[PDB]
Amino acid sequence: TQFTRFPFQPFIIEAIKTLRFYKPTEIQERIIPGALRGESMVGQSQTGTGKTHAYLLPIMEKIKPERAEVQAVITAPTRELATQIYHETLKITKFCPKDRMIVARCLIGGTDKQKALEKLNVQPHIVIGTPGRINDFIREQALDVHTAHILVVDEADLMLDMGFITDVDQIAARMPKDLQMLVFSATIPEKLKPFLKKYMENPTFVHVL
């Protein structure tokens, strides 16, 4: 595996090998180091687990397992997109050392019967979900994103299109001022720039072509 180029914890290296990842992709190569440094970034890329990993891997590297608080919030426009990111996350977390387990929950709602089954016992280290669903948890006083310093907005353009950027803004609103934001989008709509300018100052931009 070439991911050794990144200073990841052993368990992460092991997860990577298990994901059958030999050489970091372009999106990965350009995002990981920056992410690890704590830079806010905007990556223009096609959807894909390679891109998913560009953010998950560095995010896993920084969780503080000891602290049972939300440390990372990841948003996606659809239930399905969110579910897939959660799948990718579990393939990494299954490798955590037993006394240092990272917990992730996926909040996507669904039918009312489904919604009612979705509950938060603990404050997961990582919260994945659609923005409105995540807002529902905040609204219901069950989730504190104030402890999280990482926000990921995936498939940003589509997000905008479905009318969810207001939900995301809200969430980012409630997070620390010194927030690290990672945005991924195939494209950069005009109606999207303000959200970006608002929460990010001197963000690193990546484009894969």
Q: Which residue type is seen at 54? A: A
Degrees to nearest 5, angle at CA 189 with 35 and 107 = 60
Torsion angle of the four alpha carbons 151, 154, 157, 160, in this order, in degrees rounded to the nearest 10: -60
Per DSSP, the three-state class of 168 is helix
What's the number of domains the chain is made of? 1
CB 22 within 8 A of CB 2: yes
d(CA 115, CA 64) in angstroms, rounded, equals 29
Torsion angle of the four alpha carbons 25, 202, 47, 146, in this order, in degrees rounded to the nearest 10: 110
Experimental method: X-ray
Which value, in Å, is the radius of gyration of the alpha carbons in the chain? 16
Strand positions, DSSP E, 124-177: 126-129, 150-153
Q: Write the CATH number for 35.
A: 3.40.50.300
Per DSSP, the three-state class of 27 is helix
Burial class (CB in 10 A: 0-12, 13-18, 19+), 169: middle
* Tokens describing residue 11: 């368990």
CB 75 within 8 A of CB 130: yes
CB 102 within 8 A of CB 127: no
Count of alpha carbons within 13 angstroms of residue 97, beta-carbon side: 10
Q: Structural domain of residue 79, as residue ranges?
A: 1-209
* Tokens describing residue 104: 């992730």
